Ligand binder design. Structure first.
Ligand code: HEM
Ligand code: HEM
Ligand SMILES: CNCc1cc(OCc2ccc3ccc(N)nc3c2)ccc1Cl
Ligand SMILES: CNCc1cc(OCc2ccc3ccc(N)nc3c2)ccc1Cl
Ligand SMILES: C[C@H](O)[C@H](O)[C@H]1CNc2nc(N)[nH]c(=O)c2N1
Ligand SMILES: C[C@H](O)[C@H](O)[C@H]1CNc2nc(N)[nH]c(=O)c2N1
Ligand SMILES: [Zn+2]
Lengths: 407, 411
């Protein structure tokens, strides 16, 4: 019941006590593990608030203090009165940072406490949302010196007044299906790229068209907004050895800013909370260029390299896949844009792990997502046993707006 | 209760109904997932239900469920349990359990071949020499001059646990590893402990970087004995690279037969503590794990040095670059000597087909994603985007404590 994890490369053993403060469920049972599955009222609300405020006041060395119990009462009362409650600013920040801290699938959590939190809870319209988002993008980009950020729109009320950013990331390239059969732009975004046009977006029908923002305030019909191009830092992709690479016409954007998750604090639900950090190299090169259901340029790169694409056993995909990721990292670093390689990130995470076990008694971690999609076993996370469980505050998935929105 | 796994690359959804036949525990709960953790004497009391379960399965598969043959066999097994406290498996039954133990191995990416497994019944074996003999014939048959064949040799089942047969080796064929006084390691670092054991058991170690370890065989719970596999039975492949001519000069070679010999085979409540089995290598086992892992031969750097890589910052991906070349070489050498091998793209492609087939014809295929995904180039193999369900089915291959930790020394 006080669980142990072993690193099989270093023999190091940590003891996880933090898991006993877990609350939500995993999907697994004693009969069947689901680790590889991608997606598994007033009386409900107060125990949740107490749990949060209890952990909040503990973290500031004021557990069971006057201030603590005061607030606990203050919140208890407001719930009885208003059927919800509002977070103090200090609690908001704490909640945000800890949702990142508890994000078991995020390899990048070593930075967790450095989160810049933008309180956008006064926002009332899509135009308002657009402004807050532009400000978030500008601050995070910082001319290439990326800083982590989250902007938080009003919490859910009765579920009919949901704030939502429909885009999955603030910045992503359009994908359009083609007359011949294939796909131009970015296949992952094809459906959304449609929904945008269905809302009256005029697509330049290019390969790298920055998608418009589709913002929904107070449960209203969502509106389209174009991010000022001067706020979208892009990197042209070239290889440091191969000069034909540039002719592939590749670039990628500097700012990964996930916008579709729900942020849960003290039982309050923030359905619009776009957050951002910086890219790990493989995210763009392994996943975004080379996945079959994506840019799938592997073929082309290997052809330009004149590799024996005849049998799998030449490992030409592997060879190509490496060069591509070499280029991505090369390009970003050349343009002074923050990026991290998978070796650096995973090492950083193993250190963050030792820290968390040491000063918190554990660190929920999801090995299926922490191990990079290339060169897995030569990164330190591979031989690292991990324990996965759900702590609060948390980022949760939520249904896509176009499947819910009452028009 | 039905469960759906989706494939996120192809949107193909499958439905698992087989997980309901699962009995054993996973280690997971609703509050904690342990899917990334590596590790998890029996009385007549629990034996017959375990036996009945198995025999039911068997007779179902041969389409004789409820038959007189089935009922008599249950009765027959029953009486033998109440009289002898255990029971013997018919040969048909032994073969079935063997194949299914493999078939149920949720970590095995190579299960597409499961029904084609040569089962050698060593249940008449009584001594270590007897074991050496059976094992030698296994290696010879399985190797087959390089055209590898799956096989397993099953030694006497456990009785009171005081008379176990065990192969003390983790695989039948493995290179020695020697710790040096300067803290460096000569040979395969994976095997240092086992090497010391052998040496202490009287093994004259040549102390080279590729010495094939002796077998250490225990029969009937007696102290284990050393035997040397005849070199002519040990097929080895010198590793060269198809474009880099300096790669041969690294002096590397690897053996062709992966034969794991330290697992326990469970069938019908019976426990076969010595059941060495073998198939053929997936390139990445040797090329990523066996050479490049930091706690193995660690030639990663030396290969990168000779490729004149920018080994200063990791951002050059020199490690990844050297890794791929080392796997290219491994596949190249094995194909060049006509020794059976499979690359990780081929293996995972086949597993996906196997898996899909299993869902249709069997209603599921237990699979451990953490182990099925290859140790390099993960997301460019089809398994990466395949959701999987992991659960435990018997017959099964189980882990078991190293015999040196649990053995009682006669002397
Ligand atoms: C600063 C550098 C950061 C890096 C390098 C990083 C890296 C990653 C990576 C590689 C993944 C796997 C995602 C995939 O492969 O699709 C991930 C997931 C995730 N990241 Fe981080 N991240 C960073 C910052 C942040 C920040 C600022 C937040 C939130 C405040 C965050 C929260 C999350 C969450 C919640 C997930 C998983 C979402 C899910 O469950 O699907 N990360 N991250
Ligand atoms: C014939 C070609 C085969 C291939 C290509 C293959 C491939 C693999 C690979 C790559 C692993 C990963 C192990 C690791 O990386 O540590 C594995 C695991 C495993 N294989 Fe197979 N295998 C084959 C045959 C067999 C046979 C003949 C058996 C049994 C009769 C078997 C049973 C198992 C079991 C039980 C595991 C899990 C190891 C564990 O639980 O620790 N495989 N297989
Ligand atoms: C629908 N599947 C859920 C899903 C969520 C995902 O979230 C990815 C994610 C989330 C936050 C990030 C923060 C920084 C960063 N560099 N990457 C980040 C990546 C990614 C893939 C999938 Cl498949
Ligand atoms: C306790 N760790 C379990 C473990 C099992 C292992 O078994 C590997 C294994 C087992 C069966 C195999 C069958 C065929 C094959 N080519 N490789 C095979 C490889 C290897 C490493 C570890 Cl760490
Ligand atoms: C901690 C971790 O689960 C462990 O090192 C596993 C990870 N996945 C693996 N997968 C395979 N195929 N072989 C292995 O040895 C391992 N090691
Ligand atoms: C099927 C599998 O669970 C799914 O593809 C996961 C695997 N691991 C992943 N890991 C990361 N970091 N990102 C991903 O999108 C995925 N996809
Ligand atoms: Zn699990």
């Amino acid at each position: 019941r006080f669980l142990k994890v072993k690193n099989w490369e270093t023999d190091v053993v940590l003891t996880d006590t933090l898991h006993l403060k877990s609350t939500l469920e995993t999907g697994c049972t004693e009969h069947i593990c689901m680790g590889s599955i991608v997606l598994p009222t007033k009386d409900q609300l107060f125990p949740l608030a107490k749990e949060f405020l209890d952990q909040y006041y503990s973290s500031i060395k004021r557990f069971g203090s006057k201030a603590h119990m005061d607030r606990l009462e203050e919140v208890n009362k407001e719930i009885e009165s208003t059927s919800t409650y509002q977070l103090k600013d200090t609690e908001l920040i704490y909640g945000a940072k800890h949702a990142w801290r508890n994000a078991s699938r995020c390899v990048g959590r070593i930075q967790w406490s450095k989160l810049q939190v933008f309180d956008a809870r006064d926002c009332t319209t899509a135009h308002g949302m657009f402004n807050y988002i532009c400000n978030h993008v500008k601050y995070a980009t910082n001319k290439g010196n990326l800083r982590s950020a989250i902007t938080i729109f009003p919490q859910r009320t009765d579920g009919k007044h949901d704030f939502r950013v429909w885009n999955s990331q603030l910045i992503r390239y359009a994908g359009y299906k083609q007359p011949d059969g294939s796909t131009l732009g970015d296949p992952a975004n094809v459906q959304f790229t449609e929904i945008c046009i269905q809302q009256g977006w005029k697509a330049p029908r290019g390969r790298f068209d920055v998608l418009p923002l589709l913002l929904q305030a107070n449960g209203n019909d969502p509106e389209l907004f174009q991010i000022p191009p001067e706020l979208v830092l892009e990197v042209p992709i070239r290889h440091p050895k191969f000069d034909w690479f540039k002719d592939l016409g590749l670039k990628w954007y500097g700012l990964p800013a996930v916008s579709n998750m729900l942020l849960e604090i003290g039982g309050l639900e923030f359905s619009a909370c776009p957050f951002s950090g910086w890219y790990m190299g493989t995210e763009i090169g392994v996943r975004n260029y080379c996945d079959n259901s994506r840019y799938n340029i592997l073929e082309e790169v290997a052809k330009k390299m004149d590799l024996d694409m005849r049998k799998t056993s030449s490992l030409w995909k592997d060879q190509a896949l490496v060069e591509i990721n070499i280029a991505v990292l090369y390009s970003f670093q050349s343009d002074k844009v923050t990026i991290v390689d998978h070796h650096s990130a995973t090492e950083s995470f193993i250190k963050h792990m030792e820290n968390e076990y040491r000063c918190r008694g554990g660190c929920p971690a999801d090995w299926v997502w922490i191990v990079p999609p290339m060169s897995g076993s030569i990164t330190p996370v591979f031989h690292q046993e991990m324990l996965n469980y759900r702590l609060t505050p948390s980022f949760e998935y939520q249904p896509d707006p176009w499947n819910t929105h009452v028009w």
